[PDB]
């Protein structure tokens, strides 16, 4: 699969207090209209924060927008419903006016969809992954992507987990 969803870090090292920007990116997802992803991190090592301001995420904090899903003509909506004590984020952004989107004949298929920040509480090796949730019954390793007919994309893409943070 050269079609994929993944997370990329601007850097994979961090002193205590420094922020890593974690960007959720897609590649060649046909007629893409929205994502939902469930992410697991270690809350004693990393603190979820806004990637620009450094403000701590609460359990309703919203993911920072990327390149895609920001055309206001298609009526984007965004959601965040987390369990920060368990190190779980759940992020979702999507278009609602799907007929308008299709009428443009200009699908968004490759690029950035979300950005979250992670502040190092400890300088210590740690792992971030997309992770299955019971709240997402047919999730593909904790991801559900949709096309512009409003249907779930059920196959044909890879979920590429990010590299380790502060490995040595």
């Amino acid at each position: 699969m050269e079609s994929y969803i993944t997370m990329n870090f601007d850097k994979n090292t961090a002193e205590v207090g420094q922020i890593i920007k974690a960007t959720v990116k897609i590649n060649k997802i046909t007629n893409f209209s929205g994502y939902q992803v469930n992410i697991k991190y270690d809350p004693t090592v990393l603190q979820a924060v806004n990637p620009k301001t450094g403000v701590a995420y609460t359990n309703s904090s919203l993911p920072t927008s990327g390149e895609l899903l920001v055309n206001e003509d298609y009526g984007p909506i965004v959601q965040g419903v987390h369990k920060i004590s368990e190190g779980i984020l759940n992020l979702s952004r999507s278009y609602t006016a799907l007929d308008v989107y299709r009428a443009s004949e200009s699908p968004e298929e490759t690029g950035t969809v979300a950005v979250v920040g992670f502040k190092a509480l400890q300088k210590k090796a740690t792992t971030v992954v997309f992770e299955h949730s019971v709240t997402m019954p047919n999730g593909i390793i904790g991801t559900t992507l949709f096309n512009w007919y409003g249907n779930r994309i059920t196959s044909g893409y890879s979920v590429i987990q990010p590299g380790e943070i502060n490995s040595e």
Binding site: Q79, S92, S94, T96, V134, T135, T144, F146, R152
Partner: protein
């Protein structure tokens, strides 16, 4: 007189486990008579003793956009639809304030989002907001509504 029959399906993809729940419970009325029927788990309905004539057929279900089919001409036993080509019903005209408004719009989306990212064991979960009845309220449910965003009953 005659038997009017057919198939109703919701307009979203189902599974073996969810289909029998979501295909059942559509009420099909022959307007002008007091004759109705409710679809079974295969989406099938049957109304007997219908008098010959021309009717509007009305289809309703909680949290679905009401449909009217005009000029249904009945001269003998008639099949309105088939299992391979059913009448589709659009989920996501939600009961808000104990009433649906016959439009699928942002308010319907916001109603679902009140329990976004929950599963059936959560106290916050409400089965009515789980449109595809997969036991979770997730982006799938929201995208089902988005399929017909900004539509009203006359758009069927």
């Amino acid at each position: 007189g005659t038997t009017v029959s057919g198939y109703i399906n919701p307009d979203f993809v189902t599974t073996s486990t969810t289909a029998p729940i979501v295909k059942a419970g559509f009420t099909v009325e022959i307007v002008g008579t007091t004759k109705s029927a409710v679809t079974d788990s295969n989406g099938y309905f049957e109304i007997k003793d219908v008098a010959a004539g021309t009717y509007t057929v009305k289809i309703t279900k909680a949290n679905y956009l009401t449909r009217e089919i005009a000029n249904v001409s009945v001269t003998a036993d008639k099949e309105l639809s088939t299992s391979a080509s059913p009448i589709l019903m659009w989920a996501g005209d939600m009961a808000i304030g104990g009433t649906q408004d016959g439009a699928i719009n942002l308010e319907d989306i916001l109603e679902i989002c009140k329990a976004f990212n929950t599963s059936s064991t959560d106290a916050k979960y409400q089965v009515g907001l789980d449109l595809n009845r997969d036991g979770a309220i997730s982006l799938e449910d929201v995208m089902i509504v988005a399929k017909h965003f900004g539509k009203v009953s006359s758009d069927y």
